[PDB]
RNA sequence: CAUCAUUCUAUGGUUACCCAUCAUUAGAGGAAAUUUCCAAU
RNA sequence: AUUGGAUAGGAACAGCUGUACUGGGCAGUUACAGCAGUCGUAUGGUAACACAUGCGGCGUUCCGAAAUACCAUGCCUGGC
RNA sequence: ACACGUGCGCGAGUCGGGGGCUACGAAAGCCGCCGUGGCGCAAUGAAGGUGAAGGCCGGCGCCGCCGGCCGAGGUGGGAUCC
RNA sequence: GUGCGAAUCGGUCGUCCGACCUGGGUAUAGGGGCGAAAGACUAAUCGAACCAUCUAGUAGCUGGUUCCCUCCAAAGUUUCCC
RNA sequence: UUCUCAAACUUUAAAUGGGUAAGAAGCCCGGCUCGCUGGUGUGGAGCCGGGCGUGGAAUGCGAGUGCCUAGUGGGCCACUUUUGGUAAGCAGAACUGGCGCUGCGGGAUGAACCGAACGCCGGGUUAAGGCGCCCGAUGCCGACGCUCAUCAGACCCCAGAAAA
RNA sequence: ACGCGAUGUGAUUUCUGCCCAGUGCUCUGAAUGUCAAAGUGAAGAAAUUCAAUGAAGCGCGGGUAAACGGCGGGAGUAACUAUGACUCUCUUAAGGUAGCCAAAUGCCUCGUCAUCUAAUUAGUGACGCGCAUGAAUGGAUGAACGAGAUUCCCACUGUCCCUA
RNA sequence: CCGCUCCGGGGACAGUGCCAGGUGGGGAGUUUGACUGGGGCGGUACACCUGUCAAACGGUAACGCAGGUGUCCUAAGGCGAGCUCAGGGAGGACAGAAACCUCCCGUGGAGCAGAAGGGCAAAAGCUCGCUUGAUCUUGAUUUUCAGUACGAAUACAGACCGUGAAAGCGGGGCCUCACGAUCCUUCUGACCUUUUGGGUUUUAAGCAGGAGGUGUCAGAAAAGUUACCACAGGGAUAACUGGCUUGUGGCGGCCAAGCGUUCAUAGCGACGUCGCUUUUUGAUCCUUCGAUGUCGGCUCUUCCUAUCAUUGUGAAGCAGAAUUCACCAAGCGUUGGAUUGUUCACCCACUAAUAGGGAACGUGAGCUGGGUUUAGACCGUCGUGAGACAGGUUAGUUUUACCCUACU
């Protein structure tokens, strides 16, 4: 009879996310005259740490080319990306690390980052630690691009839309073992309250659909249906195979 | 059981016995405008559930199996129900039971 | 003795209609391969 | 041609001894011969009845249609 | 609310209780072309409905209907009375 | 163990740079919260807080059911019944 | 022929038991009715009208009838019969009487055993039980026996013993 | 997506066997059974009735056990017996593999053997036909750690002899 | 410069509103029979029939005894006719114990669908012939019984019929069992009633008779779990003691087939048989459920004798020594330990001996809390699961006397 702890995470209260030092929102430069017809260039002014993120995030300041007021951006940091370099933005950009160029006006087996999905979003796909995506193929007629995702899933995205160069800074993070449940608590410190993680077999039959028993068991199949209530969508929710993922 | 598809019993307006032509009894389909299924189907319908009983006891295996009892004289040709006893097995003129036969 | 084809008749034959066929609905039934049979099927 | 019994037929075992299968032997199996053991039996002893002594015959448990690789031969060992 | 018993009034009726008229009195009294109405006086059928003694003597041994007169059973037991 | 105390006291213990301790501010509210999970905690209240009402809830089950005398005086059996 | 048996065997077959009858609604002639029954004013029934009171076994007793109606619907015990059970102060029936609802005399003491049922009293008399003393009554010159126990025996139910 | 969310297991080491029949989950609707409203079509004076049609799901067909889970019985057999590599049959979706064990899991049971003792239903080491062990329902191990559960030895001692 | 969407990405789809189908313990509500030598498990003694119990009317109980039932039958119903059956004896080619054929005996010893009982011989059985009285319809009655239903039945009456020459006989089964209310559905019946302002027509609703069924059979619509549990109660009812009882356990007699070289009885005693005891277990349900603290130990007193030792003795198959049997006998003893929570058992060692018992299975305001026996946890088996397990494992609050008595 009592809610399980998925459905209170959904309120908020106490598993919203921990943004009092959170650096800004890493969002890629606004379109403008100056991204569609050519390039607009920034300074990196400092590479910074975000809290919570694994990647650094750049300070990049541009210019504004309407008022005599200096724009900052706060760009995911390329891999290889330093301070006091320019870094340029625009249809009319060169195809080096931390330029951000729209997707359709660079070539094929191009590694990108930060891409927006949908054009004009402020990067959305491939900002993550370590991560990049691969432009395959371009398609003039419906003006369209096959990307393939860090999932593996190749999507095809509006070349219009645009991508900074190169794989996000941060990467091979997850090759390092956290060794002690206090680098796990520190960690997710940083994030949201999700981490001691109490498996539903040891919760009571009133919690979770897993619960009670003389042994610590399911008892039920822990693969569930898509169309499962919230309540009972719990173990391996709308699971096509299991077990020792064997082949490719 | 086994009785005989002719049957010369009474006929209740020909007032006499007459050959009669018999067939078993079948219910008819459940008319949807009975007043009974209507008022059903207004109580059921909305929000309440189920609002009369579902039997489920059920205990008996087999029927009174009823002859549909047929007057052949083309003027009158009126029928009744003929309720028999319980039986599992039942044939209408299937095949006469004989003596001095084998048993092979 | 049996069956068909023929005409002659008979107080006889429903003509908005008879019969052989075409069809579907209404019931009854086997030799053999397989042997060594039995009662089946 | 499904099938379903049967009963036609193959199988796994058989208390010890003795004799015969061999160039000669270790073992079997089989043929058999006598006791056991089964079976009947009449006395000897009963208050019980369960033995004893002697004589005359004597495998079982399975699996339908078989199904077994090769079958009773497997081995060792002597040929100047 | 109902049933039965009992007391009282009236009695094939009965009842104003609602309405109206004229200190105790918010009582009491009165109405009758205020009994509307209730319950009783009639039942029975699901319903359409129907809806609670007869005999004898004559005009035509028996007549459909003409009339005539007496006319709401019988047996048994029955307090009382004669 | 009618206490100092509706959880305290003594010795003895566990830990003591870290998933450490802690005050204030702040958020989450009752089939809800919160839970390193004991059905734990949510104001001495928790396998559904507390407050008022519905509510004089219902009870084939316990308990009680107030003066005197006089007369009559039982049943625990039948049949049917979640 | 002989031995022995039967709740679910039986030729026989009790005691106790269960019906019914023991008059006037009866008996008795006579006539009427009928569509029933018919060889037949046959058979049967139903009606009227007469005449027959020694009131037809004993004993006791005034009866008949209708409304309304509470409580109860856990029972228990005993003689005899009786089922299950080794038995049980066990479980279950039959009949009647008890207790429950009930005091009283006796059984020392007991819900039920025995006697007897109850207004408040005086005298008398008993029942069942008693009568050394407790404790009313044998304190009779009671009758005849029987019995010695180093475990005497001593009064329905009933409260402690067998084979030997 | 080196992200978020949902689960199981629980460091390291060394491993993680077989089963997709069942129950889920999932993929597929182009040979298509079942299927609602609406819509369509016909019959009727109409209400209505009938027929075709017909989504998801279910059925049918794949996949999947680090999804829930599961992982046999009976005979004969070696040249003393005992054991049975081997054989025969029954039989499943697959018949419990590597390990481990009278374990915190073994009913019988205080198992049998060894060891510890003067004596041990205790302990450890072994043995496994294991009522009912077993591989992320994780198996086997395991240094360090522990107000965890045991057993023994030394030392110590009023726990005791036996009390003051 | 000119403009009509601010640019871009979608777009008649998302999506929303409303219906429809599927999924839906994620939530909700509710249920989860009864009887019962406690409950459960199992059975059905829950509706019904036979013989018995049952005590010679009828009636009569138990989870009494032995059984049967949820059907079956177009004949196994209905007449009529003719036959005689089971079994036996004696014969007869093949032919035998058993085929068929005759004659004789044949009281029913067969058969009549089934359980059992009753009934039955020119039949109620057997074999044939024709048939549909197993039909239509009012009442009355019997059985259970309240003298209500139902089922089943009995006598009539009115029809229409069958059979037989006819008398008759027949409205199911030779009799005793084989079954079902209201509501709803369905069918059948009549030139039926009403469908509400009248009329016609479908339709619906009525009236009357069958059917679909409630087996918990006078008739709810229904799964578990609780060791996290709660409440009303119950000694109407289990888990202690105590009662009754003594099957079982223990202990003891009787008789004497045998044992004992001999020899029933030194010591034993089989086949039988009579008891006692309440330190065994049962049996029961009487007391206690507004509570009698529910294992063992520890401690401490008293008591019993069915005597292990010690005192006195009797008998031996008693030479001595050691040991057995029995008697008067409970004065006085009956130990230290290993393992086990244990009572019990077992072993070591000492010892005159290492007897057995009672006192609310003595003794928790005396302790202890090891075991069972709450809530936490692990395992195995079981269950889809919650959970279960006289199955192991570990951790788990032991309150009060100052009253009366008793004792000091």
């Given at each position: 009879?009592?809610?399980?702890?998925?459905?209170?995470?959904?309120?908020?209260?106490?598993?919203?996310?921990?943004?009092?030092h959170?650096?800004?929102?890493?969002?890629?430069?606004?379109?403008?005259?100056?991204?569609?017809?050519?390039?607009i260039?920034?300074?990196?002014?400092?590479?910074?740490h975000?809290?919570?993120?694994?990647?650094?995030?750049?300070?990049?300041?541009?210019?504004?080319?309407?008022r005599?007021?200096?724009?900052?951006?706060?760009?995911?940091?390329?891999?290889?990306?330093?301070?006091?370099?320019?870094v340029?933005?625009?249809?009319?950009?060169?195809?080096?690390?931390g330029?951000?160029?729209?997707?359709?006006?660079?070539?094929?087996?191009?590694?990108?980052?930060?891409?927006?999905?949908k054009?004009?979003?402020?990067?959305?796909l491939?900002?993550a630690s370590?991560?990049?995506?691969?432009?395959?193929?371009?398609?003039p007629?419906?003006?369209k691009?096959?990307?393939?995702?860090?999932?593996?899933?190749?999507?095809?995205?509006?070349?219009?839309?645009?991508?900074?160069?190169?794989?996000?800074?941060?990467?091979?993070?997850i090759?390092?073992?956290?060794?002690?449940?206090?680098?796990?608590?520190?960690k997710?410190?940083?994030k949201?309250?999700?981490?001691?993680?109490?498996?539903?077999?040891?919760?009571?039959?009133?919690?979770?659909?897993?619960?009670?028993?003389?042994?610590?068991?399911?008892?039920?199949?822990?693969?569930?249906?898509?169309?499962?209530?919230?309540?009972?969508?719990?173990?391996?929710?709308?699971?096509?195979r299991?077990?020792?993922?064997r082949g490719? | 059981?086994?009785?005989?598809?002719?049957?010369?019993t009474?006929?209740?307006?020909?007032g006499?016995?007459?050959?009669?032509?018999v067939?078993?009894?079948?219910?008819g389909?459940?008319s949807?405008?009975?007043?009974?299924?209507?008022r059903?189907?207004?109580k059921?319908?909305?929000?309440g559930?189920?609002?009369?009983?579902?039997?489920?006891?059920?205990?008996?295996?087999?029927?009174?199996?009823?002859l549909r009892?047929?007057c052949?004289?083309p003027n009158?040709?009126?029928?009744?129900?003929?309720?028999?006893?319980?039986?599992?097995?039942?044939?209408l003129?299937?095949?006469?039971?004989?003596?001095?036969?084998?048993?092979?």
């Amino acid at each position: 009879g009592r809610v399980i702890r998925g459905q209170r995470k959904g309120a908020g209260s106490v598993f919203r996310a921990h943004v009092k030092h959170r650096k800004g929102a890493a969002r890629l430069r606004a379109v403008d005259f100056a991204e569609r017809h050519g390039y607009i260039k920034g300074i990196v002014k400092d590479i910074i740490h975000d809290p919570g993120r694994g990647a650094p995030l750049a300070k990049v300041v541009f210019r504004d080319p309407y008022r005599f007021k200096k724009r900052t951006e706060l760009f995911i940091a390329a891999e290889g990306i330093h301070t006091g370099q320019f870094v340029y933005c625009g249809k009319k950009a060169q195809l080096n690390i931390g330029n951000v160029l729209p997707v359709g006006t660079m070539p094929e087996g191009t590694i990108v980052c930060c891409l927006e999905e949908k054009p004009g979003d402020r990067g959305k796909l491939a900002r993550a630690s370590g991560n990049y995506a691969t432009v395959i193929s371009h398609n003039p007629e419906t003006k369209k691009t096959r990307v393939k995702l860090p999932s593996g899933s190749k999507k095809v995205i509006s070349s219009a839309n645009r991508a900074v160069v190169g794989v996000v800074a941060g990467g091979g993070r997850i090759d390092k073992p956290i060794l002690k449940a206090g680098r796990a608590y520190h960690k997710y410190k940083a994030k949201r309250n999700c981490w001691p993680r109490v498996r539903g077999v040891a919760m009571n039959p009133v919690e979770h659909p897993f619960g009670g028993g003389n042994h610590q068991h399911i008892g039920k199949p822990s693969t569930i249906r898509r169309d499962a209530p919230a309540g009972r969508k719990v173990g391996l929710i709308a699971a096509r195979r299991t077990g020792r993922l064997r082949g490719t | 059981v086994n009785v005989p598809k002719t049957r010369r019993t009474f006929c209740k307006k020909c007032g006499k016995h007459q050959p009669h032509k018999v067939t078993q009894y079948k219910k008819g389909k459940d008319s949807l405008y009975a007043q009974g299924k209507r008022r059903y189907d207004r109580k059921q319908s909305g929000y309440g559930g189920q609002t009369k009983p579902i039997f489920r006891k059920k205990a008996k295996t087999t029927k009174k199996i009823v002859l549909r009892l047929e007057c052949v004289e083309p003027n009158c040709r009126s029928k009744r129900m003929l309720a028999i006893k319980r039986c599992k097995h039942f044939e209408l003129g299937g095949d006469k039971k004989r003596k001095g036969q084998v048993i092979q």
